[PDB]
Amino acid sequence: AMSLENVAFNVVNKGHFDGQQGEVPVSIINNTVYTKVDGVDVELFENKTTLPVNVAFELWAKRNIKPVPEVKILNNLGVDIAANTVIWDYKRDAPAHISTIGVCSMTDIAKKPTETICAPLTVFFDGRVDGQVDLFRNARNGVLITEGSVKGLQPSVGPKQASLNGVTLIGEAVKTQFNYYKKVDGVVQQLPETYFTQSRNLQEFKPRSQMEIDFLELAMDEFIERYKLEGYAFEHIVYGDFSHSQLGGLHLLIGLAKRFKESPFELEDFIPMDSTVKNYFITDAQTGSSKCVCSVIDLLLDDFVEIIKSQDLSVVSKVVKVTIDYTEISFMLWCKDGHVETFYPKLQ
């Protein structure tokens, strides 16, 4: 017996949908769900989605509360829908996928991912749930995550981090590093060798290597000297150039983190969604240097150094393609006299 009042009862008593029996009084006003608590209305949910308020409330209550892949990974792997769960996208305050399978009567296209309506969609399967590995084997298109070996299936070790209730973390009390598998048209696809983005924040950035510790603690010229980075334009690409009206370079998150500790700046997230490469309209508060579209990627500095040092520097300009988070990221590489001028995630 699925109902708005039962979903609300579960949120109030269990912190989320937990299949418990019960009902609480609910009032819906505009895009907000309230419940009566001792005569007064208490807000349970504000709809920030393009779905009807009561439908979005139910999908949010039915969100997966285990560590799940970050939405950028699912998107890069072509995931269209999840099997019998909701992957909540905390970057967008919305369900990661339009439709559901066995979750909500309003958004369900099927009750089971074995229904033929699901065959053309890449269904997300979670091996931690009974029967989901078998459902992936029977699925025409799909992405599977597991905590271990699936007999005969060649795995892809994914990122160390996962999203647990919107908190991206590397698990200590829980497992966040999964094996990934993908099928396209009934055929298991070999996932490519890839780098992974680190998913760090500007305000709580922590270094994850000796090189990263040295970047944050050492001065620009001594770091470049220590890591033999002369001629690789790190002064522009990583540290950033704030001397002209147009802000130069600044494409690695660690470079923004170093700058942030000294001088504040505004980052306008004009397409707010989870993605491997992020685009910001940046305004440096100290200098007034700005850039409408500043592409930023959070790679471990060692990974970025390996990528830039593995390029041929004899061409004026060329597209450099790098697999990051399972997707092909195009970078624009500009050279002059055998040295780098700039290297940035190519603005499509």
Q: Which residues bind ligand K3A (CB under 6 A)?
A: 136-137, 150-153, 183, 186, 188
71 CB-near residues (< 8 Å, 6+ apart): 87, 89, 91, 96, 163, 273, 274
- Pick what 242 binds: its own copies, ligand K3A, none; C-beta below 5 to 8 Å, kind-dependent: its own copies
Annotated binding site for uracil: which residue ranges? 291-295, 342-346
Q: Exactly one of 251, 258, 309, 318 is catalytic; name it.
A: 251
Closest contact distance (angstroms) between CB of 87 and ligand K3A is 21
Cβ atoms of 87 and 64 within 8 Å: the answer is yes
Known active-site residue 111: no
1 CB-near residues (< 8 Å, 6+ apart): none
Closest contact distance (angstroms) between CB of 203 and ligand K3A is 41
Integer Cα distance of 136 and 6 in angstroms? 31
Residue 38 or 185 with smaller CB distance to ligand K3A: 185
238 CB-near residues (< 8 Å, 6+ apart): 215, 249, 250, 251, 252, 254, 255, 301, 304
Cβ atoms of 237 and 344 within 8 Å: the answer is yes
Name all contacts of 34-42 with Cβ < 8 Å and 24+ positions apart.
35/8
Residue 308 or 324 with smaller CB distance to its own copies: 324
Q: Exactly one of 291, 309, 321, 339 is catalytic; name it.
A: 291
Known active-site residue 339: no
Strand-by-strand arrangement of the 317-324 sheet: 317-324, 327-336, 339-345
Residue 3 or 154 with smaller CB distance to its own copies: 3
Closest contact distance (angstroms) between CB of 333 and its own copies is 21
Closest contact distance (angstroms) between CB of 324 and its own copies is 17
Position 337 contacts its own copies (CB under 8 A)? no
Residue 10 or 146 with smaller CB distance to ligand K3A: 146
Position 235 contacts its own copies (CB under 8 A)? no
Report the DSSP pairing between strands 108-110 and 88-89: unpaired
Residues 288-307 that bind its own copies (CB under 8 A): 288-290, 292-293
Tokens coding 241: 């150039």
- Pick what 202 binds: its own copies, ligand K3A, none; C-beta below 5 to 8 Å, kind-dependent: none
Residue 183 or 278 with smaller CB distance to ligand K3A: 183
Q: Which stretch binds its own copies (CB under 8 A): 97-105, 189-197, 211-219, 318-326?
A: 97-105
Q: Which of 138, 209, 210, 243 binds its own copies (CB under 8 A)?
A: 243
Q: Exactly one of 236, 318, 321, 339 is catalytic; name it.
A: 236
84 CB-near residues (< 8 Å, 6+ apart): 101, 102, 103, 113, 129
Q: Which residue's beta carbon is nearest to the bound ligand K3A?
A: 137
C-alpha distance across the termini of the chain, in Å: 48
Helix (H) or strand (E) holding 339: strand 339-345
Known active-site residue 251: yes
Residues 195-214 that bind its own copies (CB under 8 A): 204
Q: Which of 150, 153, 169, 218 binds its own copies (CB under 8 A)?
A: 169
Q: Side-chain half-sphere of 310: how many Cα atoms within 13 Å? A: 9
Q: What residues are annotated to the active site?
A: 236, 251, 291
